[PDB]
Structure 1
């Protein structure tokens, strides 16, 4: 409730003179409003959102000096009656790119974006892991996570699928588990939600089309390749290869094959969560995404 949000801001930060309040955006974890056209106030929607925010509160101050683009800097830190936090930060300027917006960038700008994104990812990968861990960033046991997923999928998802889709999923999980090249990695800090719905851009700039990056709630210590997952899903294979090349990846084919598997796993994880929530529209969406994934990977099987 936007009126209730305004009330908490006024009570806890009475010196903010509120002239305007509007809805700005919403995800699965947070509701965001814009105050005075300048300040984003972001309120967790769930205990999980609050736990992710507590991590961001500790991590983001450590990142600012290490990352070139702008990121949220929490200047106001509030508390709700249940004890969980909410935050206010100066709006990260620019227009949200979005999946739909990525397609139409002039190639010069696309290339500039690929370079900036490559540089951002390199700085995350360079951040000391123990420093992140001491700031409460969780360590993802990626191999065990995928093992557990494969089991939950066979049990809970397979009964909804036709035989061709079940065989496809069996093949994909087996591919990741069978080839040691895919499962050996040095753990690194990743953003964890690196998609164009979090890319703030200024299409009227040449050297720096990427203005900033938001939503660090999924930051984790994991396989750094996992940070390509939304680039491949939303921005496409060519773009992803361009970012990889700028980061100095010598084996593009192998790493694209690997990220593609992560994309499959993310899609089935999404469906599984929808299923557990008995959310019918979410399940329908998840099934469509799965069908699309299989079609996108025709021939990858052989």
Structure 2
């Protein structure tokens, strides 16, 4: 709940942590993170889903450290809340959070170095033995069926709010994904699942390695490795994404970019659809704003 309340969980379960400073650090849909002594992130689930995602994270992350070059959270304290659900403490992953708006004014030379690090990172995930991840509780995402269910729920619940031009737009997008076997055929791989620049920790005092780490593995799953590109396209732009894909040895950039483009559209609409289900009056006038612009950005595809 409030600050003394999180503080008190730590003191009781970890009384040898001498607490000198406590601050809010960050917050998402699944978690609330504070910073203790400028050193230690304690991250508390906000819901059952959060708690379930952390559980997977708890099992997955100790397996990824040795196989991933950048820093990732390492859960050094593991607490239990009244409900049996966990919370975790970890050494802050050092550096500055990139964010969307901040990739723009990221130094050009560092930018290219970043793309290559991101490429080896994703390569490293795509190399992690899939059945090993599954045994550690990483869910298998049936992306084909999932997108299908999405098409209907958008038909049913989103269409009534859209003008004709926008409805036609989604039909074609969903159709395009489903009609072309190339887009839908893929080898399932471990992905991060929430690979956006608000989880990139950066450092301009490193010319060789301006990417210091990556956080929030809550959405880690077995799926289409192309899905890990979705926020790179949305937040970092298309030129940056072609760079990463090229560094990953992707022969057909155009095919794979168009495919990721669709993934974006499906995310923008799965967003609204969720705001819809949740009665949120502006997680609705927002989800609509981004659909119109997703339509805009794809001006003639």
Deviations 1:229-256 (A, max 9, x none): 0000000000000000000001000000
Q: Structure 1 residue 127: deviation in Å?
A: 0.1
Deviations 1:150-182 (A, max 9, x none): 010000000000000000000000000000000
Take 1:163 and 1:203, find their aligned partners in 2: how far apart are those partners?
A: 47
- The alignment's TM-score, normalised by the length of structure 1, stands at 0.99
Take 1:52 and 1:289, find their aligned partners in 2: how far apart are those partners?
A: 27
Deviations 1:110-157 (A, max 9, x none): 100000000000000000000000000000000000000001000000
Q: Structure 1 residue 106: deviation in Å?
A: 2.0
Q: Structure 1 residue 227: deviation in Å?
A: 0.2
Deviations 1:26-82 (A, max 9, x none): 000000000000000000000000000000000000000000000000000000001
Q: Structure 1 residue 220: deviation in Å?
A: 0.1
Take 2:206 and 2:12, find their aligned partners in 1: how far apart are those partners?
A: 40
Take 1:66 and 1:2, find their aligned partners in 2: how far apart are those partners?
A: 36
Q: Structure 1 residue 204: deviation in Å?
A: 2.2
Aligned to 1:226: 227
1:54 aligns with 2:52: no
Take 1:122 and 1:2, find their aligned partners in 2: how far apart are those partners?
A: 39
Aligned to 1:185: 186
Deviations 1:93-115 (A, max 9, x none): 00000001101122211100000
- The alignment's TM-score, normalised by the length of structure 2, stands at 0.99
Q: Structure 1 residue 281: deviation in Å?
A: 1.2
How well do the aligned residues superpose, as a CA RMSD in angstroms?
0.4
Take 2:190 and 2:5, find their aligned partners in 1: how far apart are those partners?
A: 36
> Structure 1: which 5+ runs fail to align?
none
Q: Structure 1 residue 3: deviation in Å?
A: 1.1
Take 1:70 and 1:92, find their aligned partners in 2: how far apart are those partners?
A: 7
Take 2:56 and 2:20, find their aligned partners in 1: how far apart are those partners?
A: 31
SS of the residue aligned with 1:289? helix
Take 2:289 and 2:103, find their aligned partners in 1: how far apart are those partners?
A: 22
Q: Structure 1 residue 203: deviation in Å?
A: 1.7
Take 1:299 and 1:100, find their aligned partners in 2: how far apart are those partners?
A: 26
Structure 1 runs of 4+ aligned residues shifted over 6 Å read none
SS of the residue aligned with 1:136? coil
Equivalent residue runs for 1:118-129 within 5 Å: 118-129=119-130
Take 1:281 and 1:160, find their aligned partners in 2: how far apart are those partners?
A: 14
Take 1:119 and 1:256, find their aligned partners in 2: how far apart are those partners?
A: 19
SS of the residue aligned with 1:154? helix
Q: Structure 1 residue 228: deviation in Å?
A: 0.1
